[PDB]
Amino acid sequence: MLSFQYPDVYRDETAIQDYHGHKVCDPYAWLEDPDSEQTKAFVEAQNKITVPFLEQCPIRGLYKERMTELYDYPKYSCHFKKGKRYFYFYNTGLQNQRVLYVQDSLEGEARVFLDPNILSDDGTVALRGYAFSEDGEYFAYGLSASGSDWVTIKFMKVDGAKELPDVLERVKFSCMAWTHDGKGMFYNAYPQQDGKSDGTETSTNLHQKLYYHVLGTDQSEDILCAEFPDEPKWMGGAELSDDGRYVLLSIREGCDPVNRLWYCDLQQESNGITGILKWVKLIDNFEGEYDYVTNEGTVFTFKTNRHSPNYRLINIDFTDPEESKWKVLVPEHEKDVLEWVACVRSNFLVLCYLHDVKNTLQLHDLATGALLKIFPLEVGSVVGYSGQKKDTEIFYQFTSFLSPGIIYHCDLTKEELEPRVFREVTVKGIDASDYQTVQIFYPSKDGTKIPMFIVHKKGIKLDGSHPAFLYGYGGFNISITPNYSVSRLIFVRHMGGVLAVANIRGGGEYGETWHKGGILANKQNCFDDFQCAAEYLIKEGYTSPKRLTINGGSNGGLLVATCANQRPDLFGCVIAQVGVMDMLKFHKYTIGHAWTTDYGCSDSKQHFEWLIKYSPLHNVKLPEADDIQYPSMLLLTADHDDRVVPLHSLKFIATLQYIVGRSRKQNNPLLIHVDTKAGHGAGKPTAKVIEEVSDMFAFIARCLNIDWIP
């Protein structure tokens, strides 16, 4: 099947580094430079063999046609009110970017407010963050180009959608919050740096600061309100309390769910915002997470995990701040994770829980924390919500593996609350009744029971004849909950496949203890859990090794790449998207320094010893047995992925091709596709999304020789 030859790639055999006595050769270190002629030539040569392989067979075209037809359905976000107007995002179906609409009332005619599609020919300029002024009359929005994390903040007067001159540059990983006097907005920016800042550079991002922009002025006049010169990795995000009196600064260092919480009583400022604010360091450590919900005078309600791995609600009174004085408003649940909490209609709280990887929604009283109402939902996820303190209604969006979703609305002014369906779209061509979603719990190596969702056609025989697509992430306290994917359903319907999602450790499915169970010294638990998910699917008859594909992105790309090295005999195909492959150098680039909380950092001998055992780049090895080769592998990345710099995938594919690809027994392809004008994934235009899934499924189809079922 390999009618092509792997590109010749220079090996710098002098690139040797000592890691606590352990010598490590990095012959493809030169691929770390995205701008060199050598790296550019490498990328071109790789794409030259991958593209024809993916497009050779009719399958890619069949899949693309079907995806284009099925993904073409009206897509709405739930409504949200700002000032006296309602807003919502909407995509007629195949627009590259969804469009923001505005209407003066729910029954009123809607009009285009912000259409990102007209900002580029190919839909590569996307909205990335936004914030309306408290009165809803002004609007700030971030724009990212080519998928980069870099943002340019622009402004508009809402009435008439008038463009304002204000433009803020050097913005990345920024919060946006307007002071309630309507004078300006807080945001974050990084200092000037040598080289490019367009998403193609690998430069580490340090010294992020907090600024205040006065509307109607030049960015050069912005006020520096907080900075951490002796702590280059700290990032301070600002938000205003609901009453507009306090600026709450959440300081983060790394990716753990913990933050310092400082506050500034704006009324106490000597003469408005003129410099470094008079910060009161309420919580001055990284021992716990404190997420602002609302306040009533000096009594602040926070969602926290302080000595509560499943999260809970506490009230901290700024006038009697000692921990011994905090009140527990809504105690922690024994197993269910309190995901998020919102305050609406002054004294109501909307609590969203995660029960065995499915969302539940409840209304509670702010004063006592008592449960008032349960908003009924089918098995799935809450992916959208609106309703701030001054609002008197809520909107919430539900989705699942089989349904595109339902948007509900509830008028909270009514004495007898009655939630109603507000918007529900049906996708023609896919009959949800033909499929089934089951949740099972399988034992991992150490006996821990891991949840896994399996989606398949009703009535299939568990004879191991079906191709399967097993997905996982496993890290950063992220819970992988039910979501609607047309691309995956096409695999089920048109490729006769079985979909599976394993809720492995490292995630947040069972709180912080679940997260800790898949990080640092225990990172191997993630890989074991995932390998055991595969073993379960095989032993139970859903699939067989030769018919099994595993997929993951970012931390999930690391997951599947490691599994390929560790158990090549278990998988037929592996698709790793924008994955972290060099675990010894990840911290050196862009925002990679933040991931050390989940992975550790190679500067430590103890951490190095963990990392070296699973780092994909450092564990490529020909299988011992003569009848075992590596699975077919496809790595997907893009040239503007400044979240996980592409060098990770470049170095990994070079290594796979050299160590494994050259072996005579290796007949399964080991390929990479590097896209242009794209990044980590957020904001990717519809056209690119369609091309990507078409590539993924064509690779699977060709490698496993699966017949398309029309």
Q: Which residues have a catalytic role annotated?
A: 554, 641, 680
What is the token pair recorded at 366? Answer: 């702010």
**Type of residue at 665:** K
Burial (CB < 10 A; 0-12, 13-18, 19+), residue 609, is middle
DSSP 8: P
Distances (CA, A) of 541 to 240, 533, 636: 54, 12, 30
Compute how many other C-beta atoms are within 10 angstroms of the C-beta atom of residue 255: 19
Scan for tokens 């926070």, then name that residue: 302
Determine the straight-line distance between the first and last CA of the chain, rounded to whole angstroms. 25
Is residue 340 within 8 Å of residue 348, measured between CB atoms?
no
Gaps in the chain following residue numbers (C to N > 2.5 A): none
Scan for tokens 């996982």, then name that residue: 472
| Backbone CA torsion sign across 604, 610, 615, 619 | positive
What backbone phi and psi angles, to 5 degrees, belong to 500?
A: -145, 140
**Type of residue at 641:** D
Compute how many other C-beta atoms are within 10 angstroms of the C-beta atom of residue 333: 16
The half-sphere exposure of 423 on its side-chain side, counting CA atoms within 13 A, is: 18
The half-sphere exposure of 40 on its side-chain side, counting CA atoms within 13 A, is: 4
Is residue 663 within 8 Å of residue 626, measured between CB atoms?
no
What is the token pair recorded at 465? Answer: 């004849």
